[PDB]
Paper text:
Eukaryotic protein synthesis typically begins with a specialised initiator methionyl transfer RNA (Met-tRNAi) that is delivered to ribosomes by the translation factor [name] as part of a larger preinitiation complex (PIC) with multiple other translation initiation factors. Only by re-engaging with GTP can [name] participate in further rounds of Met-tRNAi binding and protein synthesis initiation. This requires the action of [name]. [name] first removes eIF57 and then acts as a guanine nucleotide exchange factor (GEF) to activate [name] and facilitate Met-tRNAi interaction and rebinding of eIF53. Here we have used single-particle electron cryomicroscopy (cryoEM) to resolve the structures of [name]αP/[name] and [name]/[name] complexes from [name] to an average resolution of 3.9 and 4.6 Å, respectively.
The final model shows two [name]αγ complexes with a minimal [name]β NTD helix, each bound at one side of a central [name] decamer. The resolution varies from 3.5 Å at the core to 18 Å at the periphery. Each [name]αP is inserted between one [name]α and 2Bδ and also makes contact with the adjacent [name]β to anchor [name]αP to [name]. In contrast, each [name]γ makes looser or transient contact with one adjacent lateral [name]γε arm (see below). [name]γ is the GDP/GTP binding subunit and is orientated so that the nucleotide-binding surface faces inwards towards [name]. However, upon [name] binding there is a local change. [name]α residues 58–64 form a clear two-turn α-helix that is not observed in structures lacking [name]. Ser52 itself does not contribute directly to the interface with [name], and the phosphate remains surface exposed. However, in [name]α side chains of T41 and E44 contact [name]α D84 and Y82, respectively (non-H atoms are within 4 Å).
Numbering used by the authors:
A (entry chain A), C (entry chain B): 1 to 305
B (entry chain E), D (entry chain F): 192 to 381
Write the structure that this text describes.
């Protein structure tokens, strides 16, 4: 009898497929929590799932996609707790709704492409940043559409993700180079469109993914090239920062301590930046193309009370 | 060539007594049969008007405090599709001098679509009336344009019949008058 | 009897000291060329040195500091050819001037510090980019002045230079971190002053050094932090580009070829960018503090005719 | 508080007949004994003048087409050191509205120095005349400023008695009137 906390349920099926990502894995674990542990009373169910979400955030704090999944699960159990079935059917009604995310959010990524293929037009040199697999889910259907384009992939120092794209869509058959991440300003005068992928959307439209998407965003603004971001609808999160600095990793982004003998010195600054709403200009979700004030309204309506 | 700006700039002098003047450029060779008619209709109600040409609008851009756009259609970005020409550049000179940009628009001019590829929503016209030589064999190629797009960044406010709205608040009026279903208005659901 | 071309004179004394840099090594080689090979006629002397400068540029083309040294040597032999000594004394007069650069340009780097220490004020967090040793020659005398500051060093991908500073002034005893090069935009809101070092100055004031000094410059402009550059007076070069793209490395900055089996994919974009005159605001040379229009006049007067 | 702008704004009406008006802010609590005298001297030669306070200059910044600075000293950047106060922020509101910024300056006001640390060239004054309570024991700390620096980016042109010059062309006038030697004017050559 599993306890669903850390790895007795969650981290097992992350090794089943390296295509499922973190937040829908969190959705799958949280629905299979109360799919079995349903002790016929509406009180301790919500206590169990709130305890489970807080210990799962307590497992890995610096992967804020997890917070997005573990909080839209609370929105799911709140709205499915609504319609007021007196808990007599909801013990069966909520769990038969249940797996509609793993039948729904799993097949959201081609629904992204079905509305985002009509962005990359003919002969567009494209800049992507980091292994954001929804961007590749758009680009796969774009190359299957037989449309002519070129791609440029940045480095993802120190998180290594930029080396994956050049070994991902090269074998699909797209002419692609791998620029280094510092060389954006000398090339973004030539890049037609730039895509990124978020690990979170704030309450105004923000990109909380990686090391330097604020840098490539402010390069996109002072080259006046359109800065799109491909995401999907399990990436909304309540966390609305105000600076370019989020929750810390373990200390401040500006360390000034002493290296003892030979410890690592690359990851000493920040690793997850923030982008304001001005630098993004259109984001892609399951809900269509979505201007950032629309994503602000969409995350302002389902989070108030 | 918009009846909205014409009726508004007449009724701003007819009922209210706010005196001003209106620079007007011609969209050669399209609004040059309309901008002079526009100046004639404003000189009949004698509001201090004067016609600038297209090339002489940057010199007079520092003097002018405000532009106004009578558009044709406006999308969910607020990136509108205008009349004949001029507005893709003079609104840019307005943005670069931090000059405010108005846009009056009827509510029927909305569209729940999106500017996916911006040239596909732009009506390039014919090459007859920009050089009447009709070069037979030398045949210098040329380009006309009967539609100028503005982005929402260059534009400042929308004056509609249901109030004033931000360019970043045009989506919600559309979803107050349209649905999610009829934007891909096609039986062959691909 | 040496021939002074490639390595029979030049590359030997580069292994003598890893403190001398490329252009003053070029100055030393070009003065020791005609310090010995002076065949008593003003005709073939200039042919010899022009042939030597062009073959030395032909040796390594992508190290434009070499072009700066090999062209200010031509300015030296032109002005020392001026004053019109009828070549009777100039066979001795020019060579006894001679080594005044290796007595002058070698000791220019502390003359940089004697006028640039009064920039880094009390409690200034400093951003440097790349192993520009004139910046460390300023910072060494700054830390010897016992003034209180902090430093932040970027990566220098792919040219590795950012790892050298953290193993250079740490052992001098300065609190310093090593930020990754993509994380500039999330930290440059906090950095007080930013220094770089050029591998060249164009005819308007430009930074032709490394991969991404245009990126850190345009981040400095949209954070409105002052963007200084420490250099010295053997770094003037005639090469005045107009784009953000210089002479190529071997092909364009946007490759789209095919990797054959496992060849290197990091250095596929550009490696030497360009900065316009707007983003720099003050540069430091032997000639004092120098606004970029002053460096434009100084490189406009000694290069016309 | 500059006799240069006062004599120029009198002689612009006395000989030439260019009519205009001049908004003027007070640098409280320093130019408030001078800006009212400035308005009195301009109302004696009756050029349409009006006094704005400091806080009400951003609202009237959109109306005004030009500012002008009577400075005290100007460096080799063109980053000048002005009179009493106000100009570090109102020139910034001029730059952000893309409003041109003048700077009249005598040639003796030059300096071949450099603003090494900008606070050291700025004269912070006394805390007496900004709150006359003289708080004994509660003692809320406070800051006064009698010198506002502008950078050369915020400023546009220099009107001197030897012609008009860019802010990026102030070095060469200095080296036309100074040398390399007397900038570190000190016997103890360190």
């Amino acid at each position: 009898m599993s306890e669903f906390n850390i790895t007795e349920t969650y981290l097992r099926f992350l090794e089943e497929d390296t295509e499922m990502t973190m937040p829908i894995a969190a959705i799958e674990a949280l629905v299979t929590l109360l799919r079995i542990k349903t002790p016929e009373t509406a009180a301790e169910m919500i206590n169990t799932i709130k305890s489970s979400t807080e210990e799962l955030i307590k497992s890995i704090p610096n992967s804020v996609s997890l917070r997005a999944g573990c909080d839209i699960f609370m929105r799911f159990v709140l709205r499915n707790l609504h319609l007021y079935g007196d808990w007599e059917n909801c013990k069966q009604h909520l769990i038969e709704n249940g797996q509609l995310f793993v039948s729904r959010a799993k097949k959201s990524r081609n629904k992204i492409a079905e509305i985002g293929v009509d962005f990359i037009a003919d002969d567009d040199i494209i800049l992507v940043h980091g292994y954001s697999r929804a961007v590749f889910s758009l680009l796969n259907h774009a190359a299957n559409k037989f449309i002519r384009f070129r791609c440029v992939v940045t480095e993802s120092r120190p998180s290594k993700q930029g080396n994956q794209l050049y070994t991902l869509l090269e074998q699909k058959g797209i002419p692609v180079t791998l620029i280094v991440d510092s060389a954006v300003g000398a090339v973004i005068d030539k890049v037609d469109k730039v895509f990124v992928g978020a690990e979170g959307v704030a309450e105004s439209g923000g990109i909380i993914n990686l090391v330097g998407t604020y840098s490539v965003g402010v390069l996109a603004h002072n080259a006046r090239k359109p800065f799109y971001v491909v995401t999907e609808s399990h990436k909304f999160v309540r966390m609305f920062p105000l600076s370019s600095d989020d929750l810390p990793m373990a200390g401040p982004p500006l360390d000034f301590t002493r290296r003892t003998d030979d410890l690592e010195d690359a990851l000493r600054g920040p690793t997850i930046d923030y982008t304001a709403q001005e630098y993004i200009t259109a984001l892609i979700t399951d809900l269509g193309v979505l201007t950032p004030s629309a994503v602000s309204e969409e995350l302002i309506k389902m989070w108030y009370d | 060539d918009s009846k909205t700006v014409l009726k508004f700039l007449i009724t701003a002098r007819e009922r209210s007594n706010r005196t001003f003047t209106v620079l007007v450029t011609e969209g050669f060779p399209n609004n040059t049969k309309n901008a002079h008619e526009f100046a004639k209709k404003l000189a009949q109600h004698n509001i201090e008007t004067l016609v600038v040409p297209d090339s002489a609008v940057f010199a007079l851009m520092s003097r002018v405090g405000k532009v106004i756009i009578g558009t044709k259609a406006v999308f969910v970005n607020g990136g509108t599709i205008s009349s004949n020409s001029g507005v893709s550049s003079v609104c840019e000179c307005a943005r670069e001098f931090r000059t405010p940009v108005f846009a009056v628009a009827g509510l029927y001019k909305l569209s729940p679509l999106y500017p996916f590829d911006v040239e596909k929503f732009v009506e390039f016209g014919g090459s007859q009336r920009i050089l009447p030589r009709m070069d037979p064999r030398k045949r210098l190629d040329t380009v006309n344009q009967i539609t100028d797009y503005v982005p929402p960044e260059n534009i400042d406010i929308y004056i509609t019949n249901v109030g004033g709205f931000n360019p970043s608040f045009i989506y919600r009026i559309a979803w107050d008058n349209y649905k999610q279903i009829d934007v891909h208005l096609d039986k062959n659901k691909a």
